Amino acid sequence: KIATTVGEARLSGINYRHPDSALVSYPVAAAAPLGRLPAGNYRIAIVGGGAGGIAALYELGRLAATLPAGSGIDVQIYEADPDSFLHDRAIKVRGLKAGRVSAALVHNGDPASGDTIYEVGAMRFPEIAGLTWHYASAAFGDAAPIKVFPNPGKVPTEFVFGNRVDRYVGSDPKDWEDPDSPTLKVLGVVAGGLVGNPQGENVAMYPIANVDPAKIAAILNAATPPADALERIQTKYWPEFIAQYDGLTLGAAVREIVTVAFEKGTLPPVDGVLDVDESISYYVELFGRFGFGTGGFKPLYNISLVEMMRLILWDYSNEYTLPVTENVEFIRNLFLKAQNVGAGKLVVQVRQERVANACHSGTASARAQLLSYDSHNAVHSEAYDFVILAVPHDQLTPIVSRSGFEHAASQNLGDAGLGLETHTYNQVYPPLLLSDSSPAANARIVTAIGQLHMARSSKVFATVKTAALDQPWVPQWRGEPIKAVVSDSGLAASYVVPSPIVAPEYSSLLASYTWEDDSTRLRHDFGLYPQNPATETGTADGMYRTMVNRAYRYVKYAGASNAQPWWFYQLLAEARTADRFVFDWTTNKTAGGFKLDMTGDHHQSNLCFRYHTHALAASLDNRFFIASDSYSHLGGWLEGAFMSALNAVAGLIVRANRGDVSALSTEARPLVIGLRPVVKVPAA
Amino acid sequence: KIATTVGEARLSGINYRHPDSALVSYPVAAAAPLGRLPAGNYRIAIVGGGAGGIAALYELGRLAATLPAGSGIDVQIYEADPDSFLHDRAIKVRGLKAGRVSAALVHNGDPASGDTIYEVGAMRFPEIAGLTWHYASAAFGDAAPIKVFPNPGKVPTEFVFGNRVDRYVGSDPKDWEDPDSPTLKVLGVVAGGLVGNPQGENVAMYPIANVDPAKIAAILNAATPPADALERIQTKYWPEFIAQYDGLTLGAAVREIVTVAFEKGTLPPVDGVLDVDESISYYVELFGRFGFGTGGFKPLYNISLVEMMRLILWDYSNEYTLPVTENVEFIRNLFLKAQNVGAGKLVVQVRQERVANACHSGTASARAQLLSYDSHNAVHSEAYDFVILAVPHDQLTPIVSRSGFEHAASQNLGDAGLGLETHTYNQVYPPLLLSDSSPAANARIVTAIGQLHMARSSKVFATVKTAALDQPWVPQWRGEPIKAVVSDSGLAASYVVPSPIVAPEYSSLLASYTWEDDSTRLRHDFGLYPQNPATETGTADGMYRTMVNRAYRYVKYAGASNAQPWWFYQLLAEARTADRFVFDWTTNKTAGGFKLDMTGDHHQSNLCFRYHTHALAASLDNRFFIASDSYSHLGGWLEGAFMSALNAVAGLIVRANRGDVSALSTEARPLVIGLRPVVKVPAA
Ligand SMILES: Cc1cc2nc3c(=O)[nH]c(=O)nc-3n(C[C@H](O)[C@H](O)[C@H](O)COP(=O)(O)OP(=O)(O)OC[C@H]3O[C@@H](n4cnc5c(N)ncnc54)[C@H](O)[C@@H]3O)c2cc1C
Numbered sequence A, B: 001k002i003a004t005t006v007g008e009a010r011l012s013g014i015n016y017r018h019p020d021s022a023l024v025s026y027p028v029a030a031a032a033p034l035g036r037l038p039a040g041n042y043r044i045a046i047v048g049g050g051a052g053g054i055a056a057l058y059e060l061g062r063l064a065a066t067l068p069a070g071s072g073i074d075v076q077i078y079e080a081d082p083d084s085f086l087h088d089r090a091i092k093v094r095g096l097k098a099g100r101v102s103a104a105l106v107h108n109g110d111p112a113s114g115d116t117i118y119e120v121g122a123m124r125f126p127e128i129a130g131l132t133w134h135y136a137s138a139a140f141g142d143a144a145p146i147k148v149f150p151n152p153g154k155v156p157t158e159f160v161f162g163n164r165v166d167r168y169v170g171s172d173p174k175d176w177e178d179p180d181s182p183t184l185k186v187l188g189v190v191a192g193g194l195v196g197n198p199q200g201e202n203v204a205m206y207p208i209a210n211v212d213p214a215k216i217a218a219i220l221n222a223a224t225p226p227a228d229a230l231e232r233i234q235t236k237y238w239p240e241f242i243a244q245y246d247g248l249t250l251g252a253a254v255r256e257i258v259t260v261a262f263e264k265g266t267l268p269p270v271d272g273v274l275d276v277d278e279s280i281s282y283y284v285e286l287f288g289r290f291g292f293g294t295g296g297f298k299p300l301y302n303i304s305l306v307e308m309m310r311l312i313l314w315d316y317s318n319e320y321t322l323p324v325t326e327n328v329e330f331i332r333n334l335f336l337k338a339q340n341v342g343a344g345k346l347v348v349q350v351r352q353e354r355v356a357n358a359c360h361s362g363t364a365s366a367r368a369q370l371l372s373y374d375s376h377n378a379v380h381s382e383a384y385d386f387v388i389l390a391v392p393h394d395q396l397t398p399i400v401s402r403s404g405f406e407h408a409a410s411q412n413l414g415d416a417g418l419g420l421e422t423h424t425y426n427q428v429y430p431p432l433l434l435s436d437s438s439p440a441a442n443a444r445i446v447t448a449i450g451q452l453h454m455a456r457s458s459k460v461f462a463t464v465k466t467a468a469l470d471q472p473w474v475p476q477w478r479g480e481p482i483k484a485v486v487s488d489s490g491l492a493a494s495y496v497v498p499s500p501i502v503a504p505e506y507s508s509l510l511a512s513y514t515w516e517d518d519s520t521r522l523r524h525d526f527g528l529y530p531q532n533p534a535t536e537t538g539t540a541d542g543m544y545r546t547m548v549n550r551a552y553r554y555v556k557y558a559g560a561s562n563a564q565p566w567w568f569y570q571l572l573a574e575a576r577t578a579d580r581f582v583f584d585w586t587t588n589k590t591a592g593g594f595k596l597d598m599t600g601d602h603h604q605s606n607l608c609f610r611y612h613t614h615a616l617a618a619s620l621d622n623r624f625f626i627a628s629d630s631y632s633h634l635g636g637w638l639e640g641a642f643m644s645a646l647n648a649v650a651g652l653i654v655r656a657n658r659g660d661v662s663a664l665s666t667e668a669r670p671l672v673i674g675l676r677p678v679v680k681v682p683a684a
């Protein structure tokens, strides 16, 4: 039942269909090349060399290999990040980034003999992330081993909220230090209320198709679901869940569930002195700090219930590591495999340039324009047949929003406010061209992108000897030291992760992984932005001491009368002086870590998710596709970036075939036709 | 009916009662000293010299003057900010701060002869902010002149969202360049749906007491309403509104309103390419950028409807300036007045120290302990009879949350993780002491404080010659230049405010005032944090050019053949190079600008609002009060800081009288007894 290889994870999730694309398993669609292109020699640009852009590249290689003699695809990949792996063909980061897949290598002067790795971005991958594991198999093979990520509850964990302390492993009470814990009670209440039961009675508060989510998850994951079941989910039942609940936050939902349980007596008054509302609030906040298996979701309480429900259906917390020293190896290997699978019909060149503007212009064959700046701030303009914009929403905004919403006789585009050189384009149309005649349609896509919510996030890391965990001052529970700490100290979630360079002498002390307001509260103490140290040889000692100081709290435990400073203070202070670190995604050019939808945001994110369906309108000469987790219903996951890349390439095939969906494979067609179109066109 | 003096504004709002405190008009309660203290020589500390701490000092001065011969009050005021006015007897900030009332003086070498002032924090004051105007009268007199703040719609304004442009003053279509504007139409729909009508048919979507909110506002603002009507609001109808709608975001409410209006045909299809959901979404987002009179509330869409409704009942957008060069003068004058009114019976000493910890300890008469560090990190400990903690919630957390939740025999408190010296306290209880028996009650207040939401905010400023507004490319409305711009450019809201140091030669170009995600999106470009320039002599030129660059967009105006770069780019570029500035409240030690409650947060903030009622529990003997806009239902307003100060001193008087509320004036008593008590047991 635990997956032990890439192939086992891949096979586990191969059928799973997400509710906003319920007609299609993306892994099934991706089993063969997505479609066919007319003969020709294509000039394509990919803006961004992260997971989205590289998966797009790989699918373009699969397509290229199918082209006849004399045909081919040329791809220019634009990648502005100087630390990208694409430009590399104490704490080191150079060459160890693929966007938000980002490693920091801790070493003593020889990077080939390092101590540990900090996974600064992506680090844990759901078992049923079928497209993720599909690409991991391309990158590593099915035989490559994987491990269970040491999430709270997967390893012995300490939880602290207010006066409550718990030590536990799992959800079986036998393995909680307090089997009567209120934390375990509230967790069961909120799980019953949100997830419900896969068999028998329906007990969940927010049904889908009148039944518990657990039952719908099993349909969505079935190899061969009943006839019409996926269509009815896609067109009726999931839309009706959205209509009902997209205006309800996660935090509001938690409070509704707790309120009913408190009224029923499942959750008792917290002590004899708290009033009703106080007890209810206590339980909401207690559950908020505890979470669903990856730490407290209190900071995520403003997300739509719809967003949480996507994660529930997907069983998101059951996660694994990759068969790597650094997660960037996945994206690097996928980039290499893209070129291999092209069979010499795909040519790729990397540009170390920042794209500033996209548009359609002129009357030549290649009308999709990109304006960029190189490392010396010199301007470059290039025209393409098709472009895939593989950057998240805040980075996309300046590229697509500054050219207006209709034809312009001429525009002098570029970063004029920076004093950089502009380029005159003539007969200009916006890049995200939904209409030849409606500025509002063109404005809807741009304004949607610009108002998506990028969740704030930060990670504080240090290096510690793994043997520190064996000290008598580190609690043991069920035979192992505590290695995960979820707390209301300001640190939020902390992990002591064994080094993957190897038991290893060293561990990565992920002292704090924060989201949203938890991250905001820390940010004044980071010192340098987005990274401290900014240099390879420095150490963020001052910053880290502010984190240790947040752990300098007197914590009362049931096992001792005289409360003492929290043991975790001591553990954080056991980290070595060198190689103390923070990265703040919020002050990175991404303007945060990843998209999470607020109430109402579905209307914006789903427009982005469906945008590639513009290809159905043959009379609309739109050459631009988008590919990022920002344009998915899995912001915060490689799976979302990969799904958006698949959408982008499917749309590109349809556009290249001048609206003919038959150019898509049987299994890939639903990537376009299973969604509500963004342009109205005739039936069939 | 435009107010022209402090007294006119003061009288306008003198009766207004907020819905969470509907039994009392705070201005009326503040008219006379709040109560009486027993004879004694009191030792009090106020932590924080912002609006809350200084209003609290003022009220202590008024109390002190009532004490008999031989009695008095000594106050130690702790103020950590080196730039505080308390420690002072090119861009200058030294001496020009009173917490989040913060001015920057732009000058050329002689600060007595400056060019303009940037109001970095508070700047605009609702007419019906009665407590605000009550203290302004104490500081400046009723005769002092006031001006209308030049809000969007108060002065000629350009609004840009997507493809839509408007130029307007107010809400009368005769004063809009396009009287048929969809923007003005959606404003009428959303305002009608949220506020409704004061007379006639109820048209609002979310009634209070089964009627439109406008009708309730007229009762809350009445001189003599039926007492029974106020009590029913306080105990039944406002609580019922909260029960229903605390789980509904503003954004969700706007969508509900727009959906019903669309279905009714009140709002037409957005051009007849856009389908139903696209039209509704367009309108929701258009309204989002337009706002309620102070710019778009899109970034505020996650607030609870309850929070928005507080602002709707208060008519918050109708705002004025103060009779000052710099807003800090208000707070300074209130500090001087406190000392004047104390009539020799108040002695005040300022300490330039950061409080690190508070607790109750020991067995002496003074048990309210404060542990602090001076500007060279030397430790200090002092005990007091009473303490007012006048700091916002993220600054309060480390002071009150690291001592546990119950009696402890001994603790070594302080900032040990920073390497700073600790102090041993014996027989220690938490400072926010709600129970002698409940650690959960002590934990509830601490945990609530720590999880309040501090809204993020930033202001980008530059200095511009006022005459730039006369350039031929600056649009006019009836001959007056546009002086406010509300846009989806990333800048959010922009103002060209005449210098108060004087038609003035210069203006303060508030290039961008952002909240929440709008601020997050900019933050990577600020360069230095919290302030660029960090020095008196620098300029934030690179940062500011990134803001000019956001304005470099092709904007199409109706009737024009083609788009040209937006004129507002040209205006921003006219600012001089020197004295370009950003302040990021988010990276200040406040960890943001001001509290705004999310869905579910009422129960957290309201616990804080009611905390001073602990004074009713006589034997508890808790000596700590809290005083900040974080502990109010008006986060983001001086009104909230002032209300919380009034609550704190009212509570202190009852505590000083061992629980006897008869020691409050008749008019002040409801400040304590008109709220639900925070301690159920013991009663009182
Ligand atoms: C803190 C954090 C935690 C996460 N945890 C997980 C996890 O455990 N598991 C998981 O599956 N996912 C996780 N994710 C999400 C995962 O990292 C992302 O979904 C994925 O990496 C995003 O890929 P992308 O292609 O959409 O965008 P990005 O990774 O942002 O890549 C975009 C690329 O475009 C480049 N670029 C941007 N603008 C320009 C421009 N104008 N011109 C040229 N180049 C440009 C960038 O430099 C970058 O390399 C996490 C991410 C973060 C930050």
Ligand SMILES: Cc1cc2nc3c(=O)[nH]c(=O)nc-3n(C[C@H](O)[C@H](O)[C@H](O)COP(=O)(O)OP(=O)(O)OC[C@H]3O[C@@H](n4cnc5c(N)ncnc54)[C@H](O)[C@@H]3O)c2cc1C
Residues within 6 Å of the ligand: B047, B048, B049, B050, B051, B052, B053, B078, B079, B080, B081, B084, B098, B099, B100, B101, B120, B121, B122, B123, B124, B125, B126, B353, B354, B355, B356, B390, B391, B392, B395, B457, B458, B585, B590, B592, B593, B594, B627, B628, B629, B630, B635, B636, B637, B638, B639, B640, B641
């Ligand atoms: C961007 C922005 C815009 C605003 N706009 C308006 C507006 O137009 N109108 C309006 O009415 N209000 C506005 N406000 C709100 C108004 O500024 C606040 O409500 C009010 O100033 C807060 O006062 P306070 O006493 O609660 O806290 P603060 O002003 O935060 O004062 C707390 C004081 O305590 C000190 N301190 C903190 N921690 C310690 C410690 N540990 N030891 C010692 N000293 C400490 C601080 O240095 C500070 O001086 C705005 C605020 C901001 C930031």
